[PDB]
Amino acid sequence: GRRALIVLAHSERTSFNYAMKEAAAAALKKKGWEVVESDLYAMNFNPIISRKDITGKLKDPANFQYPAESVLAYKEGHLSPDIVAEQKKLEAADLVIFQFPLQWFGVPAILKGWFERVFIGEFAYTYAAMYDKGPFRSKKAVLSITTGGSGSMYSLQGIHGDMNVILWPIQSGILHFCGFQVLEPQLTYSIGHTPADARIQILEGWKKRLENIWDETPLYFAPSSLFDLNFQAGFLMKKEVQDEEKNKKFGLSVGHHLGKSIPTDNQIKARK
Amino acid sequence: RRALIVLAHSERTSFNYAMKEAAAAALKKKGWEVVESDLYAMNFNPIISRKDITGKLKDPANFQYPAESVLAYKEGHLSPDIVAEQKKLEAADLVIFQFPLQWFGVPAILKGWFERVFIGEFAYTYAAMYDKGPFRSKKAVLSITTGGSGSMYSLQGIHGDMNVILWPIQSGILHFCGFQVLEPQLTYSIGHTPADARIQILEGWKKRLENIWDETPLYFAPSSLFDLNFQAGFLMKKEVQDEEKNKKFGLSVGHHLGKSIPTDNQIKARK
Ligand SMILES: Cc1cc2nc3c(=O)[nH]c(=O)nc-3n(C[C@H](O)[C@H](O)[C@H](O)COP(=O)(O)OP(=O)(O)OC[C@H]3O[C@@H](n4cnc5c(N)ncnc54)[C@H](O)[C@@H]3O)c2cc1C
Numbered sequence: 001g002r003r004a005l006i007v008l009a010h011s012e013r014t015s016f017n018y019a020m021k022e023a024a025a026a027a028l029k030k031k032g033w034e035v036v037e038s039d040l041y042a043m044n045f046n047p048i049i050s051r052k053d054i055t056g057k058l059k060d061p062a063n064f065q066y067p068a069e070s071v072l073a074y075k076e077g078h079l080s081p082d083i084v085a086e087q088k089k090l091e092a093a094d095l096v097i098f099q100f101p102l103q104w105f106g107v108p109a110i111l112k113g114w115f116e117r118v119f120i121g122e123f124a125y126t127y128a129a130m131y132d133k134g135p136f137r138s139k140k141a142v143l144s145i146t147t148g149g150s151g152s153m154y155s156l157q158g159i160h161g162d163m164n165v166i167l168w169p170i171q172s173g174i175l176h177f178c179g180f181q182v183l184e185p186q187l188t189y190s191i192g193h194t195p196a197d198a199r200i201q202i203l204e205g206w207k208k209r210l211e212n213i214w215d216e217t218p219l220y221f222a223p224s225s226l227f228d229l230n231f232q233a234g235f236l237m238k239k240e241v242q243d244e245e246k247n248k249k250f251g252l253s254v255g256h257h258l259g260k261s262i263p264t265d266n267q268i269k270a271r272k
Numbered sequence: 273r274r275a276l277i278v279l280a281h282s283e284r285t286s287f288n289y290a291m292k293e294a295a296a297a298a299l300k301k302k303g304w305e306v307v308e309s310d311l312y313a314m315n316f317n318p319i320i321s322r323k324d325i326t327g328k329l330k331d332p333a334n335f336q337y338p339a340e341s342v343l344a345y346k347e348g349h350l351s352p353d354i355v356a357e358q359k360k361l362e363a364a365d366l367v368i369f370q371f372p373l374q375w376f377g378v379p380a381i382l383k384g385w386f387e388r389v390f391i392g393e394f395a396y397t398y399a400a401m402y403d404k405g406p407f408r409s410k411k412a413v414l415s416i417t418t419g420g421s422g423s424m425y426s427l428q429g430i431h432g433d434m435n436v437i438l439w440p441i442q443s444g445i446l447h448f449c450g451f452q453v454l455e456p457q458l459t460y461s462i463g464h465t466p467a468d469a470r471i472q473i474l475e476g477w478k479k480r481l482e483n484i485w486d487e488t489p490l491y492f493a494p495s496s497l498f499d500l501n502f503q504a505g506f507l508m509k510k511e512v513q514d515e516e517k518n519k520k521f522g523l524s525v526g527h528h529l530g531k532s533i534p535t536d537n538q539i540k541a542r543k
């Protein structure tokens with residue numbers, strides 16, 4: 001059971017992405033979940049950050065700083081109402097699913113904009129409680145991505161390079177930074193070259209996984225307990241921890257590779 | 273030569289805007305012809321949709337952005353705003369992307385600019401990816417400002433290696449289309465920098481631009497190291513794979529090959 005929010009970033013209801021969104025909703029409701037949606041295109045979602053995101057009067061209108069004005073607005077209760085509606089959905093959700101086609105090695109601009117306007121300071125993150133200590137530490141997020149390129153193109157020896165590197169900015173930088181436990185991504189490669197029968201099994205496999213999604217062990221990110229969370233330290237790994245690592249073959253993550261070997265599928269398989 | 277400066281910041285009072293003005297002035301003084309794409313000031317629409325095609329859609333029942341926008345490109349049915357931006361790019365020798373780092377990437381308005389402007393056949397072909405892309409005779413540079421300090425983005429910083437963050441953008445978007453990518457201008461913790469230090473940052477950016485074109489670009493594995501076809505799955509050539517197994521470092525951030533990533537592969541030039 002519990003509550004789920006599904007954020008979809010695709011303009012066509014005829015797309016495989018829409019089908020993936022529908023499959024997820026059905027599988028989840030079937031197991032007793034309450035499922036809420038944020039179909040960004042359907043909502044004509046405004047993905048462009050601006051001073052209009054603040055309803056009240058600004059602190060410094062002549063020198064507008066989005067981070068500070070937006071935070072203050074969140075605290076005093078005067079963020080644009082469309083933003084607040086999304087924030088209420090997030091707060092209510094236990095599980096958050098992001099369904100979208102990979103576009104230029106990342107998330108669609110409309111979803112990127114959703115993050116930029118909705119993940120406001122204090123609400124989504126606090127510099128005092130980063131990553132694992134973030135506001136969404138009790139939530140779990142999952143990326144469900146469809147790709148045009150084949151899986152081989154994204155393997156260690158494929159022309160595009162390792163998919164784990166592509167996933168990092170998003171899963172660690174956005175999701176985990178806010179405290180989310182990030183689950184293994186659902187990657188559906190070359191969906192434009194997949195047989196009808198295979199497409200059918202993909203939707204059933206997704207529904208199948210969603211039946212026990214909550215109990216999955218999340219992807220591995222270096223705990224914040226390993227860093228000196230303070231300015232005059234530079235937020236660098238603590239002294240002792242850096243020493244203990246000197247003799248270790250592997251780095252900790254994609255981002256924390258430390259100049260050494262990145263554990264296999266660190267951002268794809270959550271078994272580390 | 274001709275330069276295009278794409279800026280993604282809503283405030284005329286920002287440092288990013290300042291940086292844009294510095295670049296335009298520096299380049300002009302050296303004889304460059306400078307064009308601008310102030311996305312916010314252009315009231316730019318960053319959302320891809322069928323509205324990007326003015327002509328008749330091949331298949332309106334099942335809209336596929338890639339195939340339709342490519343057909344529109346060839347037949348001349350692309351939205352007027354995209355056409356104007358593609359013309360700016362076509363003429364530009366150097367493209368500067370000036371923006372503040374937002375959620376470990378480019379602003380949504382800029383991500384959308386790429387999505388709507390970098391149309392198939394125009395900006396790339398599945399045949400001539402990367403090395404052989406349409407923009408191989410052009411050079412691109414990212415000038416980024418961040419809220420976090422430089423140490424936060426070091427191999428030991430809590431955010432992790434900035435080189436990993438830059439990869440998706442510099443390789444996946446820029447180099448994929450052919451661009452030779454120059455070293456990124458990284459301006460860290462611009463909000464905790466004394467007024468005197470910012471003036472220097474502006475001056476440092478301007479002097480760099482004086483010889484920007486003669487810079488050694490970032491290293492990306494050449495397409496010749498791969499068997500470019502589904503038959504081979506676009507993987508490195510067997511010879512390469514074997515001849516590489518004796519190397520300590522991988523080829524790049526993306527092609528780390530499970531080994532050590534060459535230091536500052538996406539920040540400093542050194543093949
Ligand atoms: C701007 C842009 C940038 C891109 N950048 C990249 C990139 O960097 N890397 C990359 O790899 N790819 C990239 N792509 C390609 C993109 O990732 C794929 O085109 C997309 O993921 C395909 O997903 P889709 O939902 O649109 O599917 P669709 O193309 O619609 O295809 C779905 C397929 O499944 C069928 N189908 C639909 N509904 C169902 C259902 N209910 N049951 C069974 N079958 C069904 C459809 O008829 C069709 O055959 C980009 C595309 C764009 C537009």
Ligand SMILES: Cc1cc2nc3c(=O)[nH]c(=O)nc-3n(C[C@H](O)[C@H](O)[C@H](O)COP(=O)(O)OP(=O)(O)OC[C@H]3O[C@@H](n4cnc5c(N)ncnc54)[C@H](O)[C@@H]3O)c2cc1C
Pocket residue numbers: 049063065066067115116117281285286287288289290371372373374375376377417418419420421462463467470471474
């Ligand atoms: C949605 C969102 C997400 C973000 N995500 C991240 C992230 O993932 N990582 C990260 O590190 N940061 C992040 N940031 C922070 C962002 O990168 C910084 O706030 C931004 O880079 C600061 O640049 P700016 O141009 O806005 O400058 P401003 O804040 O305006 O600051 C410029 C400073 O220089 C002064 N100045 C202006 N013009 C001039 C001039 N001509 N000469 C000298 N001084 C001048 C100004 O008065 C001011 O003190 C995010 C911000 C937002 C809004």
Ligand SMILES: COC1=CC(=O)c2c(c(COc3ccc([N+](=O)[O-])cc3)c(C)n2C)C1=O
Pocket residue numbers: 104105147148149150192338339392398399444448
């Ligand atoms: C509609 O699909 C695609 C549309 C794109 O707009 C796109 C793709 C890719 C990468 O995926 C590829 C798949 C196959 C080949 N190929 O050589 O045949 C090349 C690239 C990239 C980066 N872009 C910007 C697609 O696949």
Ligand SMILES: COC1=CC(=O)c2c(c(COc3ccc([N+](=O)[O-])cc3)c(C)n2C)C1=O
Pocket residue numbers: 067068121127177231375418419420421463
């Ligand atoms: C306006 O600046 C910032 C605004 C942001 O919206 C933001 C920052 C960062 C990371 O940069 C940091 C800088 C300093 C601290 N700190 O210890 O106080 C923490 C984070 C991230 C991810 N976001 C989403 C900023 O800096």
